[PDB]
Ligand binder design. Structure first.
Ligand SMILES: Cc1ccc(N)cc1C(=O)N[C@H](C)c1cccc2ccccc12
Ligand SMILES: [Zn+2]
Ligand SMILES: [Zn+2]
Length: 306
């Protein structure tokens, strides 16, 4: 049989391309292990004349790719690239409309939690350690968030169509952001026992579960905030009917519904109050509803309590 070939580029990061020659009589799986073309799995398919020149992903089956891959994703999960492509295969069909000055995601495949989280990240100062996330966040800020959402699914071990928790997701991303300058000192007091002062750093320093109001946390829940050093704070608690006031907060997640089967919305404080429901938009001067996460910006705070 006539043995024909084409040339292609393989990569793990789409930053280093490595020219390959493929036998057209064999599937890519017989030459590259698993193989993808914008996420679509091409392991079981044989080369086409049109694939010549095009860039193909591969699993890091050789030391170069392993290095390239860790340097780019900051992970060694042997399944990461696969889960990123499969997700990407899906998130590329999503629409990412600009809603109220920000990138959003039209509802599809239970992505309400990804949308609310993508709106939140555009609004708080976050610097990602993995290049993959740095690169995809920057393209994402410009309405091309298909890769950003697909990497989030793969970093948070979720599959398209499953519902996630906003707070759990953001927690994952925080583990990949550079939040080392972040500190938190708490003081707790009893009139009989004593007082316990905790100090927290990093991810734990910007996240709290039990209250939605920063102001309450500075007065007392007796636990009170003594010092906080962070670009922002995330205040979280199980959904409770709550009232947000223009100007007192940056953003917030509304979780309507039941445990692991509800709907998420994002409220943002700009010149007025806006509800960003995926690709839908309402404005209002006040807002009340089932709120679970409030986000407040910050630089430095020190208490006056003694
Ligand atoms: C969407 C989702 C996916 C995975 C997991 N593990 C949880 C959730 C989820 O529903 N979280 C909301 C905010 C929630 C959190 C905490 C307590 C809650 C009690 C009652 C209702 C909602 C509650
Ligand atoms: Zn006591
Ligand atoms: Zn208490």
């Amino acid at each position: 049989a006539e043995v024909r070939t084409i040339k292609v580029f393989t990569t793990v990061d789409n930053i280093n391309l490595h020219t390959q020659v493929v036998d057209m009589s064999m599937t890519y799986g017989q030459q590259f292990g698993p193989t993808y073309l914008d996420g679509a799995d091409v392991t079981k398919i044989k080369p086409h004349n049109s694939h010549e020149g095009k860039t193909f992903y591969v699993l890091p089956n050789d030391d170069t790719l392993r290095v390239e891959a860790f340097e780019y994703y900051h992970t060694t999960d042997p399944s990461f690239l696969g889960r990123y492509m499969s997700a990407l295969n899906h998130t590329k069909k999503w629409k990412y409309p600009q809603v109220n000055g920000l990138t959003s995601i039209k509802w599809a495949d239970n992505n309400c939690y990804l949308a609310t989280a993508l709106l939140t990240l555009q609004q708080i100062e976050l610097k990602f350690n993995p290049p993959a996330l740095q690169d995809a966040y920057y393209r994402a800020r410009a309405g091309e968030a298909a890769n950003f959402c697909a990497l989030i699914l793969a970093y948070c071990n979720k599959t398209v169509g499953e519902l996630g928790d906003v707070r759990e997701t953001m927690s994952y991303l925080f583990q990949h952001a550079n939040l080392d300058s972040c500190k938190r000192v708490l003081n707790v007091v009893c009139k009989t026992c004593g007082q316990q002062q905790t100090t927290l750093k990093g991810v734990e320093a910007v996240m709290y579960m039990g209250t939605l109001s920063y102001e309450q946390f500075k007065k007392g829940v007796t636990k009170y905030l003594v010092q906080q050093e962070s670009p922002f704070v995330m205040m979280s608690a199980p959904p409770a009917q709550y009232e947000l006031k223009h100007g007192t907060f940056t953003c917030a997640s509304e979780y309507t519904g039941n445990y692991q089967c509800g709907h998420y919305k994002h409220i943002t404080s700009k010149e007025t109050l806006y509800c960003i429901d995926g690709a839908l938009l309402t404005k209002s001067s006040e807002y009340k509803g089932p709120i679970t996460d409030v986000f407040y910006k910050e630089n430095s705070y020190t208490t006056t309590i003694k």
